[PDB]
């Protein structure tokens, strides 16, 4: 019983890092199609192991954590409303944020960001 | 009437990009201390001009837009709760997300990210 070919083995899990960057949803669907899921982090060690095997400590990798927000009237810190032109490129219609590993932290980022992603399989 | 020394001039505004990366709040306080504010984007042209004068189209720069979230019970996409060890490095206690320019989009990112920031002054 080994991890599939080209998957990284660690403790009870197999990991695979995506070839391309894309949105969170594209990652979630990609992992599904592999009989896998986006990475669920059990502890910081796991996070450190991955990041040190990949050698991209700055980059962001999508993981399996997301929240949605109700519809929001976005305003600048001075109280002025964002105008039409800027709203066209601000966040996503879905108003979701998605977790990504970066460094040795987990940060939430708009889900339409293009990031690589990490899929996981449980061996045991 | 010129922009201060070392500020970038554009249309009715002067811009200054921070020397170091730090959290959103440190940016907001830094701009204040300069008689300035974090960048408020009037339109995509402005965004393009900055990004093309700086020549860091990938990087994230804080701007003057932020939202807070109520306290949240974070769960993984499979419904399992994040454990203690992972919660220690996931987002920020404040549970805020902050806007940053990247590429030619505005993305929301956890406010404890270390990004450079852009301050603005209005000349007219």
UniProtKB/Swiss-Prot annotation, chains A, B:
Residue intervals on the Extracellular side: 1-124
Domain (C-type lectin): residue spans on this chain: 2-121
SS bond partners: 3-14, 31-119, 98-111
KW Disulfide bond (keyword) present: yes
An annotated GO cellular component: plasma membrane
Main location (coarse class): membrane
Places the protein is found: Membrane
Membrane topology reported for the UniProt record: Single-pass type II membrane protein
GO MF term (any one): carbohydrate binding
Recorded superkingdom: Eukaryota
Alphabetic keyword roster: Disulfide bond, Lectin, Membrane, Receptor, Signal-anchor, Transmembrane, Transmembrane helix
Entry comment describing in which tissues the protein is expressed: Expressed in natural killer cells.
Signal peptide: none
Protein role: Plays a stimulatory role on natural killer (NK) cell cytotoxicity.
Subunit structure: Homodimer; disulfide-linked. Interacts with tyrosine kinase LCK.
Protein name per UniProt: Killer cell lectin-like receptor subfamily B member 1A
Portion of the parent chain present: 92 to 215 of 227
